[PDB]
Amino acid sequence: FQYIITEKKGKNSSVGLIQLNRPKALNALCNGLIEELNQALETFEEDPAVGAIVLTGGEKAFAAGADIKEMQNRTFQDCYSGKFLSHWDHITRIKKPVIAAVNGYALGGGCELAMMCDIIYAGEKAQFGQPEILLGTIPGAGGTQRLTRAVGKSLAMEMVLTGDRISAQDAKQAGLVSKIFPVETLVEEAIQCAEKIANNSKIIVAMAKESVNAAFEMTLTEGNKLEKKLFYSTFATDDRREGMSAFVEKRKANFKDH
Amino acid sequence: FQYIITEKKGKNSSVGLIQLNRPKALNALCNGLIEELNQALETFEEDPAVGAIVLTGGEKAFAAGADIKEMQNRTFQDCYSGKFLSHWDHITRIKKPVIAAVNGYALGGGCELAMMCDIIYAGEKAQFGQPEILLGTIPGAGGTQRLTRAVGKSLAMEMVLTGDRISAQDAKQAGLVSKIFPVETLVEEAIQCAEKIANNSKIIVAMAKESVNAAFEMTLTEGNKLEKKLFYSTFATDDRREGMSAFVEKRKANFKDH
Amino acid sequence: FQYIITEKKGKNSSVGLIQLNRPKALNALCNGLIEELNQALETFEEDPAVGAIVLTGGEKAFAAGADIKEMQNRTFQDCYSGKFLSHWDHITRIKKPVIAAVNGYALGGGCELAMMCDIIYAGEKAQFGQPEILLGTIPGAGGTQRLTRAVGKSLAMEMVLTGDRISAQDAKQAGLVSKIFPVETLVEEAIQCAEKIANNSKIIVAMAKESVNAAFEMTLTEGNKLEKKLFYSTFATDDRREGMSAFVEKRKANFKDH
Amino acid sequence: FQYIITEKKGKNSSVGLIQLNRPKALNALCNGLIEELNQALETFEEDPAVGAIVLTGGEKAFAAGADIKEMQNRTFQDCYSGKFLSHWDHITRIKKPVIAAVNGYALGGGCELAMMCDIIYAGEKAQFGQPEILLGTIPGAGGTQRLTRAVGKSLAMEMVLTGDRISAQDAKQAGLVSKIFPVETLVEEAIQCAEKIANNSKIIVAMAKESVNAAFEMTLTEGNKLEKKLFYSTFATDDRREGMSAFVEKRKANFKDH
Amino acid sequence: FQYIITEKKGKNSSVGLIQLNRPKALNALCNGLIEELNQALETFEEDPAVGAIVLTGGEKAFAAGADIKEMQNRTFQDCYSGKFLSHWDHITRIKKPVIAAVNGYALGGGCELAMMCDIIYAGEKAQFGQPEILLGTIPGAGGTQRLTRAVGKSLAMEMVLTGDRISAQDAKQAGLVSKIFPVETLVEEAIQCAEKIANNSKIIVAMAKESVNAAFEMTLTEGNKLEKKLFYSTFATDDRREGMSAFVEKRKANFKDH
Amino acid sequence: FQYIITEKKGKNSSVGLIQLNRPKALNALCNGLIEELNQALETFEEDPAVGAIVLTGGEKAFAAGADIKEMQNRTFQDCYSGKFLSHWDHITRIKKPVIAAVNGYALGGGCELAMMCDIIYAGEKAQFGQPEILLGTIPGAGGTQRLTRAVGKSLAMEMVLTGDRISAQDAKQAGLVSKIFPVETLVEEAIQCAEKIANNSKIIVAMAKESVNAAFEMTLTEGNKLEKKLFYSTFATDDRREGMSAFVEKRKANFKDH
Ligand SMILES: CN(C)c1ccc(/C=C/C(=O)SCCNC(=O)CCNC(=O)[C@H](O)C(C)(C)COP(=O)(O)OP(=O)(O)OC[C@H]2O[C@@H](n3cnc4c(N)ncnc43)[C@H](O)[C@@H]2OP(=O)(O)O)cc1
Ligand SMILES: CN(C)c1ccc(/C=C/C(=O)SCCNC(=O)CCNC(=O)[C@H](O)C(C)(C)COP(=O)(O)OP(=O)(O)OC[C@H]2O[C@@H](n3cnc4c(N)ncnc43)[C@H](O)[C@@H]2OP(=O)(O)O)cc1
Ligand SMILES: CN(C)c1ccc(/C=C/C(=O)SCCNC(=O)CCNC(=O)[C@H](O)C(C)(C)COP(=O)(O)OP(=O)(O)OC[C@H]2O[C@@H](n3cnc4c(N)ncnc43)[C@H](O)[C@@H]2OP(=O)(O)O)cc1
Ligand SMILES: CN(C)c1ccc(/C=C/C(=O)SCCNC(=O)CCNC(=O)[C@H](O)C(C)(C)COP(=O)(O)OP(=O)(O)OC[C@H]2O[C@@H](n3cnc4c(N)ncnc43)[C@H](O)[C@@H]2OP(=O)(O)O)cc1
Ligand SMILES: CN(C)c1ccc(/C=C/C(=O)SCCNC(=O)CCNC(=O)[C@H](O)C(C)(C)COP(=O)(O)OP(=O)(O)OC[C@H]2O[C@@H](n3cnc4c(N)ncnc43)[C@H](O)[C@@H]2OP(=O)(O)O)cc1
Ligand SMILES: CN(C)c1ccc(/C=C/C(=O)SCCNC(=O)CCNC(=O)[C@H](O)C(C)(C)COP(=O)(O)OP(=O)(O)OC[C@H]2O[C@@H](n3cnc4c(N)ncnc43)[C@H](O)[C@@H]2OP(=O)(O)O)cc1
């Protein structure tokens, strides 16, 4: 890999860590980088030892956005071509949980990439923003959708129309991120979180993740019916039986992913 | 009742109070408890003197969830028998406002029961969580739906996939609960809130509640049209004439629930 | 104008400022006031020099609601004649960004008017509320819809069913408003915000605003597809090319709004 | 029962037949009739021998609507009493399939009752209509919703705004009913259909019914995701194994309902 | 009017007739024509004597679409900040029922105009189609939305992607139109239909129309709740009292429109 | 290719033909067959000479469903494995139009495959059905969703719950298919249809197809707004001008796919 670095972490290497490694362009997400990222994601998704994935960048930047230089001379017809900014949402197809550990800059595509993850942990100095408007364009990877649904209309409108950045504290207060940690312990805290998740049944975890994601795709009435079906279906797994036995039997549960 | 204690309270016994009373199992919501709860709710719903209902538990626990021992040996087929965990959402059918006064633990079904209520007040030491994942199952009573819609994706994912609990402070900050009070004044503050509601027209209050609930069942454009129709319909009541006349006449309004 | 005061305050006269000026009724929004407001909005919308609009009231009150005296003797039939409280949502049709600078009271229709704007800035002493329930009626201009989607069910239910007001601090914490400023610098800070927006391409800004508003009208999956189409379409403008080229050339760039 | 006749005219006694029996008022559905209908439905729903239910009326009329005499002296407040025209949609909660065998008149509430069923068979002389408009009211049991979704806007608008009736032929052509039979063989044909359904696994049939109903409650994208989950869940039943094995073994399948 | 003809044609002037009169361009809907159309619509909407509106064109053409010559040189820019092809959906805002009497050609904007109406009657020689694709563009006034919802995906796709026209018979079979009449009696039959509608309460009719239109804006569950609220609200009118009484009194009803 | 046969059949070789060729199992769609089908689809999608794709099978069968023998011994966990009946909806991702030419049997997965296509042409002897229920399972590839939306609740429920087949005539009347042709000329008529489509601008056609598909993914109000944005965007293409000038200049259309 020329733009990313990967390694297994956790107690039993149950955690997959992906680090964007293109320091020069503040981790600008060029087409090649996305290519590798999707590869890394796929390998971890296929590895039956990995139960969760952690995504992070540098200390100064998570990602400053997509590569502006690569899209400077593209056309409207270039957009309906199919080779312009494709595969950006492959991460939304990963069944396993993905935690974004954000230190420093998370702008444009960078902020959008973090929002595509299931959980976001931010470093004390992290900064989020959607500056697309300053470049004469608008967010094109969920910046007007995921952001608005987490932060509320007023703050989303202010961010998208002005291009202003918000601090990690503001992001936590608004619900964009769920935890803030010191710059130097961020990635570690993220890994510990991934570890807790990796310890649970992989099949049950995948169902829970689907259920939560469904909250943004249907009415509450139907969302609850779907959730109920998923709940019922867990009763067809062995881990559910094992899990509830471990409780009454007041012992630790040992899930075997099925 | 064996598992609950009821009693009218407030200004004119206009507030119905229901207290989960099964101390030994940290208020675990077994089938029998749910049975009584729905009875209590129905009586208060039918009592024309009661304008609001307050739901609370013990000081150490609101409810630690459904009874794990009652579902430990059930099956997938049992889920479709229609005899497994039935009648849990009867509370969502109550027309009158219901306030949850949460002290201590509010886990799994407990947290979900609180979220089914219209308003939530938490004690300084309250704790919310969805630990279903630790038992090899997922939330099955709105934990992946109502939670996500209030708290945002990141925190909802973190809570549901790890099983970690959050404090009352975190819950208020995230919008899960609207007010925090000292452990010993919680139930009273809740009752005072129920009292303000009980003082308003019961027919107008029921319409307002429906309108707010509709916010999670349709697009904003349609939600506004529905709200408009409801607003128009209030002009067919006497209390609306009495209320707007009491303002211009600089006097107290006397609603006749008509 | 007999109820409003207008003027262009931009540093380059690019911000349209509208001030509700009916001090005696705490800016109660009577039919005549709404008439002028829509006129003011339309003129600024048509003025190619104005890129953003700021809406504010007095120091003691933004607006205490619609005029109660004008609706106290209306009937149900009156409502369906389409000549009662009509034209209240013309502001939602304005394509240019609208910032609400709220000082003091913002109740009922006043709170709803603020929520119709794209961004809300509140003064340290601002107060929001939906006291309709106290008059024997319910919010009829989005108070049960926009409020709930920004603040969460619990707080929305509490506000709408009790009629209690919330402070500016609470509003910011809940996500109702995005910034709090001292009473005397509020309008100025709002204007500065409008200025930043006015500096961006008007055509790109209009698209960004549409995309954000779409977040409340469709599922996330479709919202993202819509956003993508809008993003593609920006590649058919000159300001986009000028905006990206300006970046790689380390030079500022101003758009000709096309 | 004074208004209905129930008898297991099924063959293996697996089909429950309910016949509206109030000849004098052309089967006008008064409160007492609905009362019994819901009872009959519940008993069959609980009877493990019954796999499907057939609903029919007289030869001249299925049902001429709700009892007009019973609602002539009601008021707006009455509607919000919580119980005026209640329990009119209990049939939509029955998990087993329900076939409506419609002979003669099916007007207003009668037409709506038929549309609430899963399948509709009409006699050659059947007539459908929503004459509510002629009584100075509108359909209030799905007549503007289920009708429109089956028949299309133009025909639904014409039917609802004029009150005109349509023939069985028109109903089949528009998709309101799926089959037309001679007046004297209608009920039998309906029973034969119920029989085919009753022969399949009750648990699988219940899932299939839910999936089809979901088509009117969510987007196609989510509808397909839900359907997929239900499909997967069938693999946790025994009947699904028996059913596919019976095909490969080229023999008849014996479903045990689990 | 330059390209329009209007006249009250009811037996009491209860029916407003609008006839597109631009023979030379096969009734091509140019900007000027749309202007007058919206005026005509508004006058009839305001006339308390008119209860329904009938819209028709010539015998050879209803409308061949929007004026192709008027949009030939316009560009992307013209589309955003433009009154370009504006006010085309004013007809969807009319509260009173609108019947489209279609003889001959109804293509592109013409077909779309017809679908915007509540009811469509077609002459034996009427032809519908969306040939936009042949001009290198797509339907932009509901041709891919209303058509699909009435006719089904297969026929809508075939019509939109090939540009092929369908006959009146095909349109009736598919549910696009609800009635076919001889070329000479079409307009007359349409007027008779408008008459039946005009005889009913104008306020109840407007509610029924809203309810039916809601069927395409929300889930079935919410659609039914909305319809129920509208039904309830009819009990606050006098005409509902009159209508139901006239039935029990076995006598004709006289609606006062309130 | 071991199970299919691909061919270029346009008048300019602009039509891609794919023929399922596994006669022995009545074209049962086994995993290998789906593999090739997706390959064939991808090649045609990438070939800039092909403007439309035609999908057909044998004269006796289009496809009898997925391979029952390949799923006979699979588990619930096999479903959540990640690769059981995978890649079945790749066809819904193809941007180019796809016509299904159905002769003979089109059951289960076969019927669902046909419904995934944009247009369906059926031979006089074609038969459609969803017999999954007879195998102790339910439709899992859109059979309860796409079928219901095209055919209506009654017929969809009857088909899915009984397993009964319907004729080509019934399918056309219900809107499932848009045209019926003699068994011998079916594929040829389908190709002619594909040809007409292939003659139009590829980029405009792709947009029209997206707009029609959006009709099942959002409310009518939003669907129309989306359509309008797509319509506007066509004004940024050359084919739009070429097409609109070709009409005004009374000459034949000149397309260049951009
Ligand atoms: C699937 N679909 C449809 C889609 C998917 C994705 C997207 C995404 C779009 C975007 O992200 S638009 C980009 C939004 N981001 C931005 O506007 C941020 C631009 N960056 C900045 O303003 C600043 O670099 C900054 C991050 C605030 C840090 O400033 P500072 O500390 O002064 O560093 P600075 O010298 O500017 O940056 C260092 C190097 O990184 C480069 N760089 C920064 N951001 C970059 C980016 N987004 N792309 C490429 N290079 C970038 C700089 O140009 C510079 O390289 P050289 O000039 O040495 O060649 C769209 C559609
Ligand atoms: C309608 N549909 C479809 C649906 C509707 C509802 C549901 C709901 C599901 C759930 O709620 S699953 C339950 C969620 N709860 C959990 O996962 C674990 C809950 N409990 C705990 O984590 C811990 O007990 C704790 C609340 C932190 C307190 O711990 P600690 O302070 O050490 O006390 P501890 O001794 O453990 O608990 C005291 C007693 O309460 C019992 N208990 C606690 N939680 C219980 C529960 N959820 N069910 C039954 N018993 C419970 C303990 O077993 C113990 O009783 P003995 O064994 O001594 O007889 C699903 C579907
Ligand atoms: C499109 N559609 C369908 C729709 C569109 C819009 C709407 C909106 C409805 C509403 O807003 S209902 C109204 C919501 N607002 C309220 O209920 C606020 C009522 N006001 C108050 O509680 C208090 O006035 C207050 C704002 C807390 C300020 O108290 P305080 O400082 O003591 O002043 P106070 O003396 O009460 O009021 C000063 C003057 O303002 C007037 N005023 C205050 N609010 C008013 C209002 N909403 N309307 C008319 N006058 C009002 C008072 O009557 C008084 O005038 P005088 O007759 O005494 O000369 C509905 C439907
Ligand atoms: C859950 N929620 C909120 C809701 C739930 C449900 C509903 C439902 C509302 C409706 O159904 S409104 C009613 C819609 N139905 C109608 O308009 C049908 C009215 N009936 C007719 O037009 C005619 O009776 C007819 C069905 C065409 C048959 O005519 P014909 O053959 O001459 O019979 P006719 O003598 O008129 O009627 C026979 C007897 O049945 C009675 N009847 C007929 N329909 C009736 C009805 N809907 N209600 C009560 N009685 C009815 C007649 O009054 C008469 O009784 P007597 O006068 O001899 O005492 C609303 C809301
Ligand atoms: C709110 N927004 C954003 C939006 C709102 C609306 C729209 C709507 C767009 C469209 O409707 S696009 C237009 C769709 N129409 C078409 O593609 C062409 C339809 N017409 C034809 O192909 C043919 O006229 C025909 C109806 C098949 C038969 O006509 P035929 O009998 O052969 O005679 P023909 O000479 O062609 O037409 C007679 C005269 O009407 C004119 N004409 C016909 N259709 C016309 C049209 N759509 N616009 C302007 N002129 C038209 C012809 O140019 C001719 O005038 P002369 O040059 O001879 O003086 C879009 C967006
Ligand atoms: C993405 N995801 C999650 C998903 C994606 C897809 C699916 C789809 C599921 C299905 O389609 S379930 C299957 C639905 N189809 C059926 O049930 C049709 C079953 N077939 C039949 O009833 C009959 O074969 C028939 C097509 C009506 C006519 O057949 P007939 O003329 O009597 O001849 P018959 O001997 O039965 O069939 C000829 C040969 O084809 C085989 N065959 C027919 N249909 C088959 C099928 N669906 N699978 C495998 N083999 C099949 C037969 O077994 C036989 O082979 P031998 O036994 O002689 O070795 C699910 C989920």
Coordinates of C-alpha atoms in Angstrom, one line a residue, chain A residues 97 115-121 172-173 175-179 193 196-197 200 204-205 207-209 211-216 218-221 223-224 227-236 239-240 243-245 247-248 255, chain B residues 68-69 71-76 79-80 84-85 89 112 132-146 148-149 151-166 170 173-174 213 216-218:
Chain A
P97 CA -18.6 -1.9 13.0
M115 CA -19.8 10.4 9.4
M116 CA -20.1 7.3 7.3
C117 CA -18.5 5.3 10.1
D118 CA -20.7 4.0 12.9
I119 CA -18.9 5.7 15.8
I120 CA -16.7 8.8 16.0
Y121 CA -14.1 9.6 18.6
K172 CA -19.6 16.3 21.0
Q173 CA -22.3 18.7 22.3
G175 CA -24.0 14.8 18.8
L176 CA -21.7 14.5 15.8
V177 CA -19.2 12.6 17.9
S178 CA -19.8 10.6 21.0
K179 CA -16.5 10.9 22.9
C193 CA -13.9 0.5 22.1
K196 CA -15.5 -4.3 23.5
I197 CA -17.5 -4.7 20.3
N200 CA -19.6 -9.8 21.3
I204 CA -25.6 -10.4 16.6
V205 CA -23.5 -7.2 16.3
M207 CA -27.9 -7.3 13.2
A208 CA -27.8 -4.5 15.8
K209 CA -25.9 -2.3 13.5
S211 CA -31.3 -2.0 13.1
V212 CA -29.7 1.3 14.2
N213 CA -29.0 2.3 10.6
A214 CA -32.6 1.6 9.7
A215 CA -33.6 4.5 12.0
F216 CA -32.8 6.9 9.1
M218 CA -38.1 4.6 7.6
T219 CA -40.9 5.9 9.9
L220 CA -40.6 5.1 13.6
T221 CA -43.6 2.7 13.4
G223 CA -38.6 0.9 12.2
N224 CA -39.9 -0.7 15.3
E227 CA -36.3 -4.1 14.8
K228 CA -38.8 -6.6 16.3
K229 CA -38.2 -9.1 13.4
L230 CA -34.5 -8.8 13.9
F231 CA -34.9 -9.4 17.6
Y232 CA -37.0 -12.5 16.9
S233 CA -34.4 -13.8 14.5
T234 CA -31.6 -13.6 17.1
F235 CA -33.5 -16.5 18.9
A236 CA -32.4 -18.7 16.0
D239 CA -24.9 -17.1 20.9
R240 CA -28.2 -15.8 22.1
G243 CA -25.5 -15.2 26.2
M244 CA -28.5 -15.4 28.4
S245 CA -27.2 -18.6 30.1
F247 CA -26.1 -14.3 32.9
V248 CA -28.3 -16.5 35.1
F255 CA -19.6 -16.3 21.9
Chain B
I68 CA -34.0 -12.4 31.6
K69 CA -35.0 -15.6 33.4
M71 CA -37.0 -15.5 28.2
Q72 CA -33.8 -17.5 28.7
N73 CA -35.4 -20.7 27.3
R74 CA -37.8 -19.4 24.7
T75 CA -37.5 -20.2 20.9
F76 CA -37.7 -18.5 17.5
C79 CA -41.6 -15.4 19.1
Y80 CA -44.2 -16.1 16.4
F84 CA -43.8 -14.1 23.9
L85 CA -43.3 -10.6 25.4
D89 CA -46.2 -1.1 23.8
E112 CA -37.0 1.5 26.3
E132 CA -28.9 -6.5 25.1
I133 CA -25.8 -7.0 23.0
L134 CA -24.0 -8.5 26.1
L135 CA -26.7 -11.2 26.3
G136 CA -26.3 -12.2 22.7
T137 CA -29.4 -10.3 21.5
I138 CA -30.5 -6.8 20.4
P139 CA -32.9 -4.2 21.7
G140 CA -36.4 -5.3 20.8
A141 CA -38.7 -2.5 22.1
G142 CA -37.4 0.6 20.3
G143 CA -33.9 0.7 21.6
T144 CA -32.3 1.0 18.2
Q145 CA -35.1 3.4 17.0
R146 CA -36.2 5.9 19.7
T148 CA -31.0 6.8 17.7
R149 CA -33.6 9.5 16.9
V151 CA -29.2 10.8 20.7
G152 CA -27.7 10.7 17.2
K153 CA -26.1 7.8 15.3
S154 CA -22.6 7.9 17.0
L155 CA -23.8 7.6 20.6
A156 CA -26.6 5.2 19.7
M157 CA -24.2 2.9 17.9
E158 CA -21.7 3.1 20.7
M159 CA -24.4 2.3 23.3
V160 CA -26.0 -0.5 21.4
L161 CA -22.8 -2.2 20.2
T162 CA -20.8 -2.0 23.4
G163 CA -23.5 -2.2 26.0
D164 CA -21.9 0.8 27.9
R165 CA -24.2 2.9 30.2
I166 CA -24.4 6.7 30.1
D170 CA -24.9 12.6 29.1
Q173 CA -26.9 16.7 26.9
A174 CA -27.8 14.3 24.1
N213 CA -45.6 12.1 17.8
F216 CA -41.4 10.7 13.6
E217 CA -43.9 9.2 11.2
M218 CA -43.8 11.5 8.1

